[PDB]
Write a protein that binds this ligand. Structure first.
Ligand SMILES: [Co+3]
Lengths: 219, 201
């Protein structure tokens, strides 16, 4: 999706302001919002790819104006409705339709073990690797309206495979109920000049991006 | 001249009430357990943070065999010190050298290695850092007080997949025979993102 979230290369966002001695949570409500994510993921109410793409689809101004955890809050209020877990009325009213009709998967006894384990997106088998480290590859010019992890700034550009990380779930399909279609992910190295042109570049600098096998073609 | 889109702008006035309403709903439907949610908050407020990565770095500085293990398998390497899990399942450690300075970003969102660095600060997740780090890293680092020699390569790593990166910064001079704990004290969060250097003694 060519949305406001795909920020790489954009101008106009200004200085990187940073707060001295920033706390982990700046407001109490952020604690609630943050802790909801693992709780709802544990239920299997949505997956992480769906979560990302729900944020991508929030209004552009809303995305820019909202602080980080407001993005998450948006997903909970909207993706849970799209998935049929909550109704729009429930969300608006804050009142459930009919009592405790579910049981929390994330309980106190399993919090530590679950957070310490996580859930790898690595998979045993998937499409064979077409590329080897040292290969020159070009990122395909694709412009899907749905979820993708090829940033706009890389499309059509030529780089060098520098790592083959192995097989992973494909987000493009996993975010849209089309299965995992596991395939290789490579780190691809681009020169500054290749990405940004002669004027806006520095001779030494490189940008590495992690890209899926079928995002690429031989250069 | 207020903050607008840098991550530090004021939230809406009614946000706390909105958050409470949703929370009451999810608890009433039986979707979430408040007691478990408190444990998650306690975990990221008090147990998981950059002191973890700092131990990883200090150990690599003093133990060449560990360093090599860590560079070969980041996940297994950080697990030797008891760090692991959510948002750090597949770790890759980026060694800074006299020739190469590494730094990472998530241009598409906020991906960051929670098990060693904790939750990211607001600036890491906002448009200014995310937009500019891949096109003008030197200009961004300068705003942090960090000037990389012209002849040193900067490698910016965009975290677009499910690999998570942490930088292994270069050990400062003047730290001969420092214990791991004393070395760890020099290792800042910024030095493990690549947006700063470890404290010089
Ligand atoms: Co991200």
């Amino acid at each position: 999706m060519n949305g406001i979230h795909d920020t790489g290369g954009a101008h106009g966002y200004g200085p990187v302001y940073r707060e001295p001695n920033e706390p982990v949570f700046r407001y109490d409500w952020e604690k609630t919002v943050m802790s909801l994510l693992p709780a709802l993921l544990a239920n299997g109410n949505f997956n992480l790819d769906e979560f990302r793409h729900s944020i991508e689809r929030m209004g552009p101004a809303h995305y820019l104006e909202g602080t980080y955890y407001e993005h998450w809050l948006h997903v909970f209020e909207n993706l849970l409705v799209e998935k049929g877990v909550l109704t729009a009325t429930e969300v608006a009213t804050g009142k459930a339709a009919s009592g405790k009709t579910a049981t929390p998967v994330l309980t106190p006894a399993i919090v530590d073990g679950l957070l310490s384990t996580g859930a790898s997106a690595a998979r045993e088998e998937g499409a064979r690797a077409r590329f080897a480290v040292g290969d020159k590859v070009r990122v395909l010019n694709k412009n899907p309206v749905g979820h993708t992890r090829m940033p706009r700034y890389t499309r059509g550009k030529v780089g060098t495979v520098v790592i083959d990380h192995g097989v992973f779930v494909t987000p493009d399909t996993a975010a849209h109920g089309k299965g995992e279609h596991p395939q290789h992910v490579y780190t691809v190295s681009f020169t500054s000049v290749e990405l940004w042109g002669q004027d806006a570049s520095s001779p030494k600098d490189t940008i590495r991006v992690d890209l899926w096998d079928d995002y690429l073609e031989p250069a | 001249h207020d903050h607008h889109h840098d991550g530090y702008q004021a939230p809406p006035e009614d946000i706390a009430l909105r958050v409470k309403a949703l929370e009451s709903l999810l608890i009433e439907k039986g979707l979430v357990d408040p007691a478990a949610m408190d444990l998650v908050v306690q975990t990221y407020e008090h147990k998981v943070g950059p002191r973890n990565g700092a131990k990883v770095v200090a150990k690599a500085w003093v133990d060449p065999a560990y360093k090599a293990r860590l560079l070969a398998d980041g996940t297994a390497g950080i697990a030797e010190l008891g760090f692991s899990g959510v948002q750090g399942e597949d770790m890759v450690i980026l060694e800074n050298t006299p020739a190469v300075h590494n730094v990472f970003v998530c241009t598409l969102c906020s991906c960051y290695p929670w098990p060693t660095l904790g939750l990211p600060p607001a600036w890491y997740k906002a448009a200014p850092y995310r937009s500019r780090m891949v096109s003008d890293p030197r200009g961004v680092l300068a705003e942090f007080g960090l000037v990389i020699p012209a002849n040193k390569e900067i490698r910016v790593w965009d975290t677009t997949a499910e690999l998570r990166y942490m930088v292994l910064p270069e050990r400062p001079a003047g730290t001969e025979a420092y214990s791991e704990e004393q070395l760890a004290e020099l290792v800042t969060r910024d030095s493990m993102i690549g947006t700063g250097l470890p404290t010089q003694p």
